[PDB]
Symmetry: C3
Subunit: 365 residues, 3 copies
């Protein structure tokens, strides 16, 4: 018969999911950013430019004001419109003569007389073109990795766990278990050898696996605990939908008090643990201790949740069980993010190198 | 006594292995390829070359035909033989004058009068030499990562699971359990506290851990299931070797219906799960529920598989148990592949950058 | 009641920790080193330099002796002091004229007459400056990844497992279980629903979870084994602290005979397994089978270890349980090491590329 601690294995696997929710899942690493370095290289290039080039960025009436492109349209026989935004950003502080001199000193160009500045400028123009070319990576720009944020991943985790973008508070305010579909009795809610559960997310699955009820506190209702049953008072034959107080008595078995570093490997391992614990039968697969007939909570029956999407003839948990597929999608996005972090480190290092060379007076000559 | 669900933990660990077999294990990422970019850079260089250089690639009698190296041997006072294959590949489409002009336009060289083309050619020759140098990585070329394919890894997984290059069909056609060595009774086949099993692969281990037999359908034969026993009808005291129908009734407890993204971390975690479930004793280590004496299938005995290669005094599963060592070898090859993917991303980005610069008329001048 | 094999799950999780100790944990990959290549590039540059530059590195009285900087101080109107150590290292073998000629040949410079050597030298000086700039990565230099060694990580693992820098031998010489704090009886040592254990490390936790004692050899003392109890003879009501012989009878359930490839993912998975097996109650969390009251070793009580740092209202194992936090710190250091390996591969490839170009006579011209 099912008794104290018999579902510790399944509780551990499901709490490995629940612990990821809320705002607890955190990315190891942000995508490398090198815009600062690119902007500095472009500004250094503008600082080294001939005065007549910087003058193109000035208003014709006030040399300290940036050129207005309605007042002074860009010539259509050039490609200047293709580059103006970046050039104007580099030029803006330099329109002030004192700031231009301060930038000359910052970039180690202030010691150069005209012919030596021309020599340096030739190298700088080459280095700057190389920086712009290297800072392009069409395989990352606008990709999944670039468009996906940590907040986006957290919301998707909360969708898998709670069917909501945010984790319910300790009273489960705003949340209705089983999507409002609970009815009849525990085995109707949690499933059986022939029918699936009404649980669409991980938290309601955990509730089916671990909640005590009015009739099993002496035995099966201790399946997920050490000694004291959770004490939900759930009475699904009378009131099918558990209250928020009941849900929280089960959620507090899980680690909701810290953070988790999001990695694809960490999600993969958690999904593999849950997925392979599913016991495949002819019409359903069962998560949790099961001895006979259904997941009714009786010590001779089961403390479990059942799925019809996966059986001994069909189905893959991470594709066919919606909440698991949602988390697998997070895994895939993390794989893309991790590859983008590796790839973007290259232009980051390249641009730091170029800035070093561009500030090296001997190299420039 | 051993009863329903008592081996769910061990079944889950072993099905985590079986699910990798067939063609289900898939690489996250192919090795970055940059041959397209290198070939384009070499072709651009040939397009920019002086006409007398391209003429070296022509037959002396028909200028549209590539030079034949028996008819017109390469001069031995040059290094041309060291480079001819790549040069001739770049030159081949360009031998047609109209195609040469089309390539000049494709590569943004068609606007250049002779002196400006010479200036551009100087930069292109430098960029092309840099591309060739960067496209070399002797630490990846001909390495394990380069020589190992996804098909190779799948075959090695199937060797660990089935001792075959391909996964047996649903009737286990062509397969003989226990390498034909099963005899006597279940405990002889599956092992004991004093002797090892006849199972050399993971599928036959799973069979020992999870198969019901004629005498345990009411009890221990339900160790891996929820309710209904698998129904093999195995009768090893009369006919020791199980049939393909019997094997499939156990294999269908595992997820053979989807795919798995092969990563070193995913294999490591699966091997660590199995390896640490091995219960080390004085003469054997046991995988599966075990109460007394041997893995006979009796509810008072064990539903398990035993190994003599690992004990409480010696042995490491991933080195000393052949099927686990075969999968650990896959893990090692995946680590090398993953490092090669990271390393090859560098020349890939470098060559894309060079192509950008080589097609930039302002940079070339 | 707790009996044979009931703690196999918890033993497996804890042995996944113990197996990392000793010197068994090994890094997949050393940080890429490119000092050899940088040194070669600097030496090639010095080999190509004009004789009057190499002469700056000679003693004024013996041209085969390196310049002494007290005898011949460096001019303060130069930056030579900022570069002297690297230059002098490059110059040292070259002070011998025959060795200088041998290096000219090694670096493919010996075919160059003066004007062609000057042309090559211009390119070499540029390539060498680029190599120096690329070989800088301030995000790795003196970072956690750079300062952390494999020995350092092994010692930290042994601190988590044993509270010592090195793993105790097979007699546990030099080791005292429970930090010398064991007293009274098993439940005082191992904890309960109301009090924490005296175990501060993973090995003593494993002892609480898996040791038999004088009164449970027929039942609960078999929780971690297959058949034969460990046979410690522990009698904590009389002599609380177990002996080294007793500790070794439990440690030998774990894989202490092989090696483990240290990765952040491998540690993360092991910590997640242990952490989520902790059964959270009102005043303590319990690792191990637990039926009633305390971890006394009685078959009706528990074979377990308790922690007050984590409960159903507070605490995260990898932050608040010291031994788990120590191992989580290893995970974090491994993440930094793994990122440094990826990042340092870039300058490694860059410097190999530069060496190739610098030894290419056609490129240099
Ligand atoms: C780092 O800092 C440097 C400055 O030190 C900065 O350099 C500037 O780069 C830009 C972009 O490469 C250069 O832009 C070119 O400008 C010329 C000159 O335009 C003026 O003078 C002409 C001639 O008198 C006038 O007609 C014109 O109205 C302007 O007054 C333009 O001629 C260039 O445009 C042609 O070439 C481009 C390709 O390079 C084409 O994309 C473009 O469509 C134009 O082609 C057309 O005209 C061609 C005539 O030769 C013809 O051949 C084509 O068929 C077609 O009809 C171009 O816009 C600018 O001169 C540089 N400034 C200086 C002072 O040198 C770098 O940009 C900066 N680096 C970075 C990365 O920001
Ligand atoms: C991008 O596109 C460019 C073209 O724009 C292309 O350039 C070609 O590169 C190759 C390889 O670097 C150059 O090959 C050289 O060719 C010369 C000339 O050979 C002809 O003329 C000589 C003299 O009249 C004849 O003797 C000969 O029979 C040919 O008719 C060769 O002299 C070169 O070989 C020597 O130098 C090499 C090192 O660079 C040695 O490896 C080789 O063994 C040779 O050395 C021998 O002779 C030397 C004489 O100087 C002597 O010093 C040595 O001791 C030894 O005895 C070399 O083969 C070719 O000229 C380029 N073409 C043009 C038009 O410039 C790039 O290859 C392409 N980029 C890529 C990456 O594909
Ligand atoms: C690869 O191999 C090459 C050799 O082929 C090697 O090149 C050497 O590089 C170093 C470092 O860049 C060069 O060092 C410079 O040396 C000059 C010359 O000093 C002598 O001659 C002067 C003039 O007669 C004397 O005054 C002096 O006492 C020496 O006899 C120095 O003038 C340079 O120092 C000034 O410029 C530096 C910036 O580049 C400043 O950091 C430094 O503070 C100095 O500035 C001061 O003086 C300036 C005068 O112009 C003035 O403008 C400033 O305001 C300030 O007052 C510098 O030390 C050396 O010449 C190169 N050797 C050759 C033969 O070319 C590469 O180093 C090597 N590559 C690598 C990476 O190792
Ligand atoms: C589950 O199975 C038990 C044992 O047969 C039965 O008593 C319950 O009614 C059922 O839900
Ligand atoms: C396994 O152990 C049981 C219990 O003692 C015994 O009945 C079987 O014969 C043996 O194989
Ligand atoms: C643990 O619980 C059992 C069962 O009530 C009791 O007999 C022991 O004394 C206690 O330590």
């Amino acid at each position: 018969n099912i008794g104290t601690g018999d579902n510790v294995l399944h509780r551990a696997a499901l709490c490995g999911i629940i612990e990821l929710a809320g705002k607890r899942a955190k990315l190891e690493t942000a995508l490398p950013n090198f815009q600062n370095e690119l902007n500095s290289i472009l500004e250094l290039n503008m600082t080294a430019a001939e005065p007549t080039w910087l003058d193109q960025f000035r208003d014709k009436d006030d040399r300290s004001k940036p050129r207005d492109l309605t007042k002074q349209p860009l010539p259509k026989d050039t490609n200047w419109a293709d580059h103006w935004t970046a050039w104007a950003k580099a030029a803006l502080p330099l329109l002030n003569d004192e700031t231009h001199q301060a930038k000359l000193k910052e970039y180690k160009l202030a010691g150069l007389q005209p012919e030596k500045l021309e020599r340096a400028r030739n190298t700088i123009r080459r280095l700057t073109a190389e920086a712009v070319a290297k800072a392009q990576d069409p395989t990352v720009a606008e990709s999944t990795a670039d468009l996906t944020t940590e907040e986006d991943l957290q919301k998707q985790i909360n969708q898998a766990v709670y069917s909501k973008d945010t984790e319910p508070d300790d009273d489960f305010n705003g949340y209705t278990a089983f999507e409002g579909k609970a009815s009849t009795n525990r085995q109707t809610i949690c499933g059986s050898a022939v029918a699936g559960s009404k649980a669409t997310n991980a938290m309601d699955a955990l509730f089916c696996v671990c909640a005590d009820d009015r009739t099993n506190g002496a035995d099966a209702g201790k399946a997920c605990v050490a000694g004291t049953a959770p004490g939900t008072g759930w009475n699904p034959g009378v009131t099918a939908t558990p209250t928020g107080t009941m849900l929280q008595k089960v959620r507090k078995l899980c680690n909701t008090h810290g953070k988790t570093t999001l990695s694809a490997a960490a999600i993969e391992g958690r999904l593999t643990a849950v997925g392979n614990l599913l016991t495949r039968g002819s019409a359903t697969s069962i998560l949790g201790s099961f001895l006979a007939t259904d997941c009714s909570g009786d010590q001779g029956s089961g403390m479990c949740v059942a799925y019809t999407e996966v059986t001994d003839a069909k189905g893959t948990p991470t594709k066919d069980i919606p909440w698991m597929q949602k988390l697998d999608s997070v895994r895939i996005k993390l794989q893309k993010h991790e590859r983008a972090v590796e790839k973007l480190g290259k232009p980051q290092h390249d641009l730091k190198t170029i800035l070093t060379l561009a500030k090296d007076p001997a190299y420039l000559q």
